[PDB]
Amino acid sequence: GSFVEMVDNLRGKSGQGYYVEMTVGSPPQTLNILVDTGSSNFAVGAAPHPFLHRYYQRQLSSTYRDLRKGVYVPYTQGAWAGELGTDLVSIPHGPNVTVRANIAAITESDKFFINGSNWEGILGLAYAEIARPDDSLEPFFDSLVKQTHVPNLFSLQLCGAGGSMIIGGIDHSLYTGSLWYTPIRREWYYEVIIVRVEINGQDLKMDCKEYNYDKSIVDSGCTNLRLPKKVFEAAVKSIKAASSTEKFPDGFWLGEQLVCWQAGTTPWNIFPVISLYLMGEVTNQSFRITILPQQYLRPVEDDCYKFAISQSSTGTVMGAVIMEGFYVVFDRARKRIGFAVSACHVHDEFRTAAVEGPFVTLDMEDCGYN
Numbered sequence: 001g002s003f004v005e006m007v008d009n010l011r012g013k014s015g016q017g018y019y020v021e022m023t024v025g026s027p028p029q030t031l032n033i034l035v036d037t038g039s040s041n042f043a044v045g046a047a048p049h050p051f052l053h054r055y056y057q058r059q060l061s062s063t064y065r066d067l068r069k070g071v072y073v074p075y076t077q078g079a080w081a082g083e084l085g086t087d088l089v090s091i092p093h094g095p096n097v098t099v100r101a102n103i104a105a106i107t108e109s110d111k112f113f114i115n116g117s118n119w120e121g122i123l124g125l126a127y128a129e130i131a132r133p134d135d136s137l138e139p140f141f142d143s144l145v146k147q148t149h150v151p152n153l154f155s156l157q158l159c160g161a162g163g164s165m166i167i168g169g170i171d172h173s174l175y176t177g178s179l180w181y182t183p184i185r186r187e188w189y190y191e192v193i194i195v196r197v198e199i200n201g202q203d204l205k206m207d208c209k210e211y212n213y214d215k216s217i218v219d220s221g222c223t224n225l226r227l228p229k230k231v232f233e234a235a236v237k238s239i240k241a242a243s244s245t246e247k248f249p250d251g252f253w254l255g256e257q258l259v260c261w262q263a264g265t266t267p268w269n270i271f272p273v274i275s276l277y278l279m280g281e282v283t284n285q286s287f288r289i290t291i292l293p294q295q296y297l298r299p300v301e302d303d304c305y306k307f308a309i310s311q312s313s314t315g316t317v318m319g320a321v322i323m324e325g326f327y328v329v330f331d332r333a334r335k336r337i338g339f340a341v342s343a344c345h346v347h348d349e350f351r352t353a354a355v356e357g358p359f360v361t362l363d364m365e366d367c368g369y370n
């Protein structure tokens, strides 16, 4: 592909977030920006903070325009407050363009910036509907598409232990096998529909509406695979039974406790695979995406791991757990999301992550929550 200058543009430590190099203002002030497909605001630190090494200085930028309006944005994890404005933004290792975008200048925050994360801002890649204060505040990618010839598409390859955010196209060297697409249900979050869940080839036997109770979303700005109360309970009991060859403390299945082994001795074989079936583009068709323990058990600072599946009250969140196993294509132009086996995904000599289809499924439209 012609996106070789875009490959390997992502960095970020385990459980802290993946970020891209971006510049704001004139002359260009370089900052590292969290890639977040679960929000829609572009906001950078614009005042000193204990965890910030650098921040956006508006007085040093000649192209800064004050919108003279304060903004507050709460997330599931973290919140910030700031002042709205516009300025020139560029992505050094992305498309060779410069755009005027809405930037929220973060002057106040809580549980947002992470110590040692190395990022100083957030790139909300989702749609305008879920942007604060309202959908009149144009997200960065909408600005980028409207002002340049860069196509209405981006793709993410999150690599657990870097990765690539390809803006405008698809690099074929970042995946193996075929690309399977699932329809975007609504343009707010990256809402998808899960039709079936399997733990080590065993169906959870639940009404498929439970898998999407509230919503099912694709979110790079989330560490965990988060599941609705009912689905989480059913999943944990199934994972616990499949991995009964070793006993673990009850706090481990809650993220409260860690589990450790000797270096290189980690027995991945005892932990089951997890398959999420996603609605296909063709009527009565579906495809499954299968993740390994390497994805849902994440290394902690002997090799120690944290159980990276948690419970949710706001629906299914397909986080980095899911996305680190796959090359994900956010095809906005065709209202669909693509999944392919990542070339950088962590696996062993016995098992690998999989994207397989098609599968026959009757009554798919029901699976969505109303």
Ligand SMILES: O=C(NCCS)[C@@H]1CN(Cc2ccc(F)cc2)CCN1
Pocket: 015, 016, 017, 018, 034, 036, 038, 075, 076, 077, 078, 112, 122, 220, 221, 222, 223, 224, 319, 320
């Ligand atoms: O609410 C949020 N995500 C959903 C909960 S998992 C995000 C959390 N993010 C910090 C963060 C992002 C990515 C990551 F890998 C680890 C941490 C700040 C913005 N809001």
